[PDB]
Design an enzyme around this catalytic site. Structure first.
Site, mmCIF file in Angstrom:
data_model
loop_
_atom_site.group_PDB
_atom_site.id
_atom_site.type_symbol
_atom_site.label_atom_id
_atom_site.label_comp_id
_atom_site.label_asym_id
_atom_site.label_seq_id
_atom_site.Cartn_x
_atom_site.Cartn_y
_atom_site.Cartn_z
ATOM 1 N N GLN A 9 35.245 3.515 66.551
ATOM 2 C CA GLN A 9 36.215 2.485 66.371
ATOM 3 C C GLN A 9 37.333 3.016 65.425
ATOM 4 O OE1 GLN A 9 35.290 -1.805 67.378
ATOM 5 N NE2 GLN A 9 33.644 -1.528 66.019
ATOM 6 N N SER A 86 29.360 5.949 64.583
ATOM 7 C CA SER A 86 29.264 4.494 64.965
ATOM 8 C C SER A 86 28.892 4.479 66.599
ATOM 9 C CB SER A 86 29.919 3.480 64.253
ATOM 10 O OG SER A 86 29.723 3.438 62.963
ATOM 11 N N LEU A 87 30.140 3.882 67.033
ATOM 12 C CA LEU A 87 30.198 3.795 68.585
ATOM 13 C C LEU A 87 29.819 5.027 69.323
ATOM 14 C CD1 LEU A 87 32.208 4.404 71.048
ATOM 15 C CD2 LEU A 87 30.699 2.624 71.315
ATOM 16 N N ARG A 111 26.599 -4.370 72.048
ATOM 17 C CA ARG A 111 26.982 -4.036 70.400
ATOM 18 C C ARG A 111 28.360 -4.871 70.130
ATOM 19 N NH1 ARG A 111 29.285 0.019 66.892
ATOM 20 N NH2 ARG A 111 27.713 0.572 65.455
ATOM 21 N N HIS A 191 27.697 -2.941 58.302
ATOM 22 C CA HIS A 191 26.966 -1.609 57.572
ATOM 23 C C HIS A 191 26.381 -1.853 56.107
ATOM 24 C CE1 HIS A 191 27.860 0.776 60.969
ATOM 25 N NE2 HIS A 191 29.111 0.623 61.004
ATOM 26 N N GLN A 239 21.525 1.013 62.466
ATOM 27 C CA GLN A 239 22.913 1.798 62.208
ATOM 28 C C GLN A 239 23.611 0.641 61.757
ATOM 29 O OE1 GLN A 239 25.911 1.678 63.429
ATOM 30 N NE2 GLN A 239 26.865 3.764 62.717
#
Ligand SMILES: [Ca+2]
Length: 281
Positions: A9, A86-87, A111, A191, A239
């Site tokens: 992202q 991440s993604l 997600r 996070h 994560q």
């Protein structure tokens, strides 16, 4: 040796993937089947700025990353290592053969829903200070509900936590030498152990899937080490409530003997981070 880096992202843009959709019609149609809208239209036209809304951003990036990888596999030798921001981890695991294209897409759709539906707290991207200096500043300014969320390069850190504390830290960070401090437009403080309920829900969601072993090693954002075949669910679920150890992941690969790092997906975001990590290492 060579590693592929998959962006997350922040790297999306209107018009992305145009040539890839043309080249991979079967996967484009299969993606539409999971999502229930035209993935090409989302990426090319960006109707109602949906590309900046995380429940659509995440599927868009997954598809463009995945097709970028398959294009690279037709044209050059396989990578030795994979890592995703991440993604990006989902596209890395797809590339490694851990799940099929549809499954990965279903996981990132979920997600995106979880993160879009998340509430409480915020985040800020900081340019020009190292981890130690950031930790010192959080302490000095009494921001006990703020933590480090991303470690992206030696001079690029994202912080996450209580909204009022994220706001109040901007001027002190700038006065300490931060070249930029930007409060991000996100649903919540991602996070941090704050996101534990979302972590638990995602973990339970992932129990319903059956995964295969990675055929190419994937470096986890949580551990900055290769994902274990039996630890896919922990790596993906934890994560979202753990610091993204991206800088350490790249340094791990450099220490393993990886010399070539290639961004696999739209844009140059991870390429710029790599330049900074390499310059410092
Ligand atoms: Ca299962």
């Amino acid at each position: 040796m060579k590693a592929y880096m998959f962006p997350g992202q922040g790297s999306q843009a209107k018009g992305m993937g145009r040539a890839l959709f043309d080249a991979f019609p079967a996967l484009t149609a299969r993606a539409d089947g999971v999502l229930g809208y035209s993935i090409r239209a989302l990426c090319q036209d960006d109707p109602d700025q949906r590309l900046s809304q995380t429940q659509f951003t995440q599927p868009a990036l997954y598809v463009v990353n995945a097709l970028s990888y398959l294009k690279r596999r037709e044209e050059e030798a396989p990578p030795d290592f994979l890592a995703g921001h991440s993604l990006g981890e989902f596209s890395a695991l797809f590339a490694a053969g851990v799940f099929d294209f549809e499954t990965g897409l279903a996981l990132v759709k979920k997600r995106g829903e979880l993160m879009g539906d998340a509430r409480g707290g915020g985040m800020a991207a900081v340019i020009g200070l190292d981890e130690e200096r950031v930790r010192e500043l959080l302490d000095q300014n009494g921001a006990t509900a703020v933590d480090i969320a991303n470690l992206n390069s030696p001079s690029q850190v994202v912080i996450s936590g209580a909204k009022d504390e994220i706001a109040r830290l901007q001027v002190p960070f700038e006065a300490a030498g931060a070249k930029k401090y930007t409060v991000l437009r996100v649903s919540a403080a991602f996070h941090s152990r704050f996101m534990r309920p979302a972590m638990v829900e995602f973990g339970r969601f992932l129990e319903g899937y059956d995964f295969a072993p990675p055929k190419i090693p994937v470096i986890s954002n949580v551990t900055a080490r290769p994902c274990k075949a039996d630890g896919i669910r922990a790596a993906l679920s934890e994560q979202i409530a753990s610091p993204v150890r991206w800088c350490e992941s790249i340094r791990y690969l450099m220490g393993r003997g990886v010399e070539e790092f290639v961004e696999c997906g739209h844009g140059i975001v991870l390429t710029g981070l790599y330049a900074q990590i390499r310059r410092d290492a």
